[PDB]
């Protein structure tokens, strides 16, 4: 939705009039994982179904002996469920933010 | 060149970068409003011009074909539009009304227009010569 002007000509032998068009640093897969860990530990997310804290140290210990398998599934497949739903999300992000028009679908 | 109204250069680029003036631009703008008075009125006279040329044919549009004396306004207008004005040079309805008013005013001798309840009925044609008054642009 940006006019995306990328003219090529200029003053003779100018080499000016660059063609910058994307103008938003779309971050790579290799870096986002940082933000993903930051989030998942800020508790905006959660595992699919995770018993947070067992009743007592007995059931907690009996669940720590459990050799989990989500270990085996890689980082980028653990199906995280949500903690703050999109509707609420629209109500808090101040509209000044340039992504506000995506909170609402 | 011959009035081929192309502009192949003005769309080149943001070449408008040489004049690195001071707030002097306000200076220019201080005169802008002034010309806005003339410019507007100038544009106005343009219709006083434009409509003019149109009527140069209209006293041969209704004349050379229509000798029904009681002709009204809506019918005659809707005749003017959709007449040869569907060729290269179109025109709008209320503009045709203006053309009629102008013809009457520049020739009240024959063309007598007087309105009854809605729409100004027009006179009974008597076929003068015209350009002799068309020179009064």
UniProtKB/Swiss-Prot annotation, chain A:
Transmembrane segments: none annotated. It is found in: Nucleus. Belongs to the ORC4 family. Present with 2170 molecules/cell in log phase SD medium. Component of the origin recognition complex (ORC) composed of at least ORC1, ORC2, ORC3, ORC4, ORC5 and ORC6. Component of the origin recognition complex (ORC) that binds origins of replication. It has a role in both chromosomal replication and mating type transcriptional silencing. Binds to the ARS consensus sequence (ACS) of origins of replication. This is Origin recognition complex subunit 4. It comes from Saccharomyces cerevisiae (strain ATCC 204508 / S288c).
Swiss-Prot record, chain B:
Disulfide bonds: none annotated. DNA replication licensing factor, required for pre-replication complex assembly. Faithful duplication of the genetic material requires 'once per cell cycle' DNA replication initiation and elongation. Central to this control is the tightly regulated formation of prereplicative complexes (preRCs) at future origins of DNA replication. Required for the recruitment of the MCM2-7 helicase complex to the replication origins. It is found in: Cytoplasm; Nucleus. Belongs to the Cdt1 family. Present with 2190 molecules/cell in log phase SD medium. The chain holds residues 459 to 595 of 604 of the full protein. The gene is TAH11. It comes from Saccharomyces cerevisiae (strain ATCC 204508 / S288c). Associates with the MCM2-7 complex. Interacts with MCM2, ORC1, ORC2 and ORC6. This is Cell division cycle protein CDT1.
